[PDB]
């Protein structure tokens, strides 16, 4: 019959609720809805529009009371225009929960299916590029059935199946010989149980001082490939296990049990080997990072509000914002995928990017000791960054004016998993777009607005933030932030004055008593299928050079440019000099001045940590051999549908380069053809006490800028006069 | 009794007025005050606190009326705690209007003061550093009279005088032999006037297609020093003049009169030579940048509000924000100066920076032609960037939650000039400060806030934005943005398919029909007197290196660090490799772990245009020779009171390097001494059509980060 307590309900729904005692007004904020309501009023204001309420908000014992329908009447009203319904479904839409369940039903109906099989990935198998661009630009329907890619792990084997969701049938079943599978979430539990039951393992720990071996936390690491020097069989499904002590401070990462490595056979569910080094006492001091021993400082409120709704519209997975149109989807391996990106140039939708996403990433360490030598995280390839998405903490992880999207992926058992607040979309003020204060004249200034698409992924101890930034003037930015807890080594020195300090700090800084933050790099690779105003592009180099003055006058030198085409994949794989210009041009289309329409590629646009010049490894290192993507900053390959991971499709225990090394090996011509740009960027992380116990976010920036793509400043506005 | 109209009055006072008809409420915003008032209410809210009103707000014909005392009662109530009164003045407070007038009076009383003398600079002559740190850190009064540095231009002669403001006396009068003075504001008008009154000039312009020479706009440029190869005499006060045609589009910069240079003698006020090249037709197409020909698309509103006031307090020129405390003052040559910067580490204020400011900057061009070969702007040095500050456009140039400060400097006649909205102070959200989402646990996230101090200066065609950014965790950022109108060359080519195209674009891109944006560099230099937890510091290098594994096991290599001290100024002057680490350390003080407290210096933290790897000049170039600061990214010198400018005190037609080249020439020891860091950073600007007719803002970033300065994450908070 009833009504419900307002603050309980709203808080539960996820709306921010402000009560203004003086104005006697409630301000309710949820994603795209900015609502104003006064107790007793018969109307409420939603994004500047009046909404008739059946039942006014009722005030009581300082308790406001609302109808049980309030949320639907207000929030689901139709006055919030942020989200729109798609009438013609986009060909790249991810698999829906229904489609995921269907695909699992089809493979499970297969004669070859075993009960123990896990799903490493379930993803759309997309139509050909040409059909997708015709849909996006000419509204030409794709007359191809929806197919899924089903990748499973059967013990230690990988099988690849293709299913037709239209016709409900298995189109292919194929075991992939040689390949090892990525780590699955149940492996985390599995490893922990194996250690739990191990007799031998308890013995070892007891010897390093741990009484209660039940307080020991494990973490699974992939083993890499050392050509047998690690003394491990290539055949088996193995994982290395590092351990920490739980001291109850909420941070087991601060209590390493150094020089103790267990090797586990996952098919056999047993510890195959226990590598032990010298006994180093476990750092026991409590180091919570959650504020339990701290006083939080008082900070006055700051709110970012959009009282009339947002400048963007989301129809299905498509986002419209000013001149940009793009499609946003989610993948369990690499997270977000940005597709069919166009820029509306005075009425003409011009192609910019067919598809862009994280390619892959690596975090390699530089310490040679037993618990470290093999340590290198391939976060997306080995662990599934999409799967480990971290829900955005409203107002902290994203500003108060963001809209948060839920996304659906399949878990490892083939059941659809909805990730709440998976992606954040928000507009932000970014200084003046342009300005010119002509002496004695009125000022000319316009504000700059940026549209940010933010996604966070947490792999173990470390948290990564990725921002895709759309600038109104045609620029596209891609930023990567890193925060979280450092991977530390237990050491005997307390201070730099101790006898073991110099040996203890050879591979990292002493950041706490008995704790060293081992030196390592963060290397990110982005796969960008740019189609600059069409598919057929060319790679052009423009090197600023000082040349002799040959024209007379007092000057001895001039500033000139060395311009040349880069014709094949081998010449296009290179180190990036930020003093130079690299363009992807369309040789077939020119701007008003007769210059080829282009985009400028900037893999290194800055960062807050020392930059990674290349891989910090000798060239005889296996990791170095297996992952060539790490050492060059710019790669341009010819478009081939299945070439998508810099590190290769199955990097677990790979023995050679099946990634970028392979894609550029055949050295195809890049002359006026469909090219794919790969940008590698990263840092060299040398630690300091300021990053302990938790690391302040550190950022790296990359950029794509229009270069003679337009005929003039793109943000000047519509032409009032002529044609 | 009688009222005034709210909107008129409030808008006149600079407050943003918002009426909400649904709530029947007015929201009034002005800098630090966020006010809410209902018509007919007996009280109002100022930054979350109630205030009793003498007279309520009255609603007329849907016209509100306020008492005559409303602003003062509301805005000056004391509930807005943003600005506090300074009872004991900081010793670096800039000269007041009164002090400026007193200083001019004292030099004017001298028999040596010639009647048409102009002032290039009138600035505080500060006490010793030691006295100034004792004030800030122990409230020890500086008992030294306020003194001013008075620099005058007598004809083409420079004179430096020092005045004692308390005793009202001239302490020194020093003619400066050989120095040339900077360009003054009246120089812009002389030049225009001289050109317009010249017969010969008009004749020359007629030649180039111009009938009415009244439509010619000039711009003054310094000529540099070519050891007589430009055919100009060193004694003389010369300026070169470039011309544009006014076609009434409000953009004379888009209409160059190429290959015509007039050399003007300012003492004699006469064209001393007209240099002409080939006739190139003037680009006539209208290219306004002001929107007169455009219609902008509709945008929904976005507002940033701080309803309870700001987290910072401004007491006199001192800013208190979270753990930071610093002093802010204005200089006519370099603009803002940030001083006595301390970090309150759990109740102990620790020294970070005695003083920081723009040192100097330069915009040199790469074309050898008649109208370009000598072209190089030393904006602060030759023109005075503080003097040319551009008032911030509220809500556009700075966000809507900023506080805008007015600043006073002397103009070139010795009269105080107040610059309205000279500086913006604003807090901004900058993503999560840190985060850790432990699998199966509650998330740990904190918001990052940045305090920005923004200043804008416009010199000729180009506009510069400088941001000094304070992070809660101890990091300091310095960002430099560039926007405005590019300096273009008129050419015959319309498109790249024209015969002249190849020759026309040898030195710059064709960005419009008959217009080439000449290649040039933007080079900024910052002077930072860091005092890392005390004055006696050392420069330490930490180079990440790959070394063979000698520990055994399967790895062939390891990641190690090559660490060494850099002991003298010649060794400290270097190119910056962003893959390396450079620290200013206090060898005398260590953190909890036994590491020397330090600050990491990063001259290149990124940018949106290609980087300047050094000067894009041969080393035999005169400009190269005169300005050493341009080619190295990091300089560390021993602290000396008068070493302030990278380009030298008097760079107009200097014959040698009197800046950083000179300061580091004596090669002093940098071992456990008071050091000064200088950071050079910049870009190489190659143009494109997207920057024409107006250039979207491009930015460069620099950073200073604590490195073992603290014992742990500085933003965790105080231990319970
Ligand atoms: Ca392409
Ligand atoms: Ca290939
Ligand atoms: Ca110093
Ligand atoms: Ca010196
Ligand atoms: Cu790291
Ligand atoms: Cu420029």
From Swiss-Prot, chain A:
Organism lineage string: Bacteria, Pseudomonadati, Pseudomonadota, Gammaproteobacteria, Enterobacterales
Record's keyword annotation contains Ribosomal protein: no
Listed name of the protein: Primary amine oxidase
Key words, A-Z: Calcium, Copper, Manganese, Metal-binding, Oxidoreductase, Periplasm, Signal, TPQ
Reaction(s) catalysed by this chain's protein: a primary methyl amine + O2 + H2O = an aldehyde + H2O2 + NH4(+); 2-phenylethylamine + O2 + H2O = 2-phenylacetaldehyde + H2O2 + NH4(+)
Cofactor note: Binds 1 copper ion per subunit. Can also use zinc ion as cofactor. Binds 2 calcium ions per subunit.
GO biological process entries: amine metabolic process; L-phenylalanine catabolic process; phenylethylamine catabolic process
Region (Disordered): 646-667
Residues bound to Ca(2+) 1: 529-531, 674-675
Source organism per UniProt: Escherichia coli (strain K12)
């Amino acid at each position: 019959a009833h009504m419900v307590p307002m603050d309980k309900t709203l808080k539960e729904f996820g709306a921010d609720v402000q009560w203004d005692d003086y104005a006697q007004l409630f301000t309710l904020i949820k994603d795209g809805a900015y609502v104003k309501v006064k107790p007793g009023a018969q109307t409420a204001i939603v994004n500047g529009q009046p909404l008739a309420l059946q039942v006014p908000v009722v005030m009581k014992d300082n308790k406001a009371w609302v109808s049980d329908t309030f949320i639907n009447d207000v929030f689901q009203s139709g006055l919030d225009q942020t989200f729109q319904v798609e009438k013609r479904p986009h060909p790249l839409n991810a698999l829906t929960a229904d489609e995921i369940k269907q695909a699992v039903e089809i493979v499970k109906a297969s004669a070859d299916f075993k009960p123990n099989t896990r799903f490493t990935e379930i993803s759309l198998l997309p139509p050909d590029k040409e059909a997708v661009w015709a849909f996006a630009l000419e509204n030409k329907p794709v007359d191809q059935p929806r197919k899924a890619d089903v990748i499973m792990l059967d013990g230690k084997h990988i099988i690849e199946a293709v299913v037709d969701l239209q016709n409900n049938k298995l189109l292919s079943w194929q075991p992939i010989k040689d390949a090892h599978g990525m780590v699955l979430l149940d492996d985390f539990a599995s490893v922990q149980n194996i250690i739990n039951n191990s007799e031998e393992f308890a013995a070892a720990v007891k010897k390093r001082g741990i009484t209660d071996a039940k307080k020991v936390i494990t973490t699974p690491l992939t083993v890499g490939y050392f050509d047998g020097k690690d003394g491990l069989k290539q055949d088996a499904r193995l994982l290395k296990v590092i351990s920490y002590l739980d001291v109850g401070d909420g941070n087991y990462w601060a209590h390493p049990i150094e020089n103790l490595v267990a090797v586990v056979d996952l098919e056999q569910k047993k510890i195959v080997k226990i590598e032990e080094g010298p006994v180093v006492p476990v750092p026991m001091t409590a180091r919570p990072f959650d504020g339990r021993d701290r006083v939080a400082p008082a900070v006055k409120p700051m709110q970012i509000i959009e009282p009339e709704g947002k400048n963007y519209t989301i129809t299905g997975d498509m986002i419209h914002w000013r001149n940009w149109d793009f499609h946003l989807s989610m993948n369990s391996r690499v997270g977000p995928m940005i597709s069919t990106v166009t820029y509306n140039d005075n009425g003409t939708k011009r192609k910019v990017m067919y598809e862009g996403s994280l390619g892959g990433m690596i975090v390699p360490y530089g310490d040679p000791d037993i618990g470290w030598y093999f340590k290198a995280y391939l976060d997306s390839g080995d662990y599934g960054m999409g799967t480990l998405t971290s829900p955005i903490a409203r107002g902290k992880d994203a500003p108060s004016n963001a809209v948060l999207l839920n996304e659906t992926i399949a878990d490892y058992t083939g059941v659809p998993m909805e990730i709440p607040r998976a992606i954040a979309v928000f507009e932000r003020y970014a200084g003046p777009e342009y300005k010119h204060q002509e002496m004695g004249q009125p000022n000319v200034s316009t504000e700059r607005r940026e549209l940010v698409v933010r996604w966070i992924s947490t792999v173990g101890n470390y948290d990564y933030i990725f921002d895709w930034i759309f600038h109104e003037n045609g620029t596209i930015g891609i930023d990567a932030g890193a925060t979280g807890i450092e991977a530390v080594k237990g050491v005997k020195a307390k201070t730099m004055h101790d006898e073991t300090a110099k040996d203890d700090t050879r591979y990292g800084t002493l950041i706490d008593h008995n704790i060293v933050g081992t030196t390592h790099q963060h290397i990110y690779n982005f796969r960008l299928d740019l189609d600059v105003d069409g598919e057929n592009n060319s790679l052009v180099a423009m090197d600023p050079v000082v040349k002799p003055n040959t024209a007379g006058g007092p000057r001895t030198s001039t500033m000139q440019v060395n311009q040349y085409n880069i014709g094949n994949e081998q010449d296009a794989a290179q180190k990036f000099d930020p003093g130079t210009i690299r363009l992807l041009s369309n040789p077939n289309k020119e701007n008003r001045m007769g210059n080829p329409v282009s985009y400028q590629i900037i893999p290194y646009a800055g960062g807050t940590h020392p930059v990674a010049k290349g891989a910090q490894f000798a060239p005889d290192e296996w990791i170095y051999h297996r992952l060539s993507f790490m050492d060059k900053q710019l790669w341009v390959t010819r478009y081939h549908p299945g070439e998508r991971f810099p590190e290769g499709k199955y990097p677990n225990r790979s023995t050679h380069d099946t990634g970028l090394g392979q894609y550029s090996k055949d050295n195809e011509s890049l002359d006026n053809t469909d090219a794919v740009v790969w940008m590698t960027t990263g840092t060299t992380h040398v630690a300091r006490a300021e990053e302990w116990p938790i690391m302040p976010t550190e950022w790296v920036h990359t950029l794509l800028k229009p270069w003679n793509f337009f005929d003039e400043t793109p943000t000047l506005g519509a032409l009032k006069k002529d044609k």
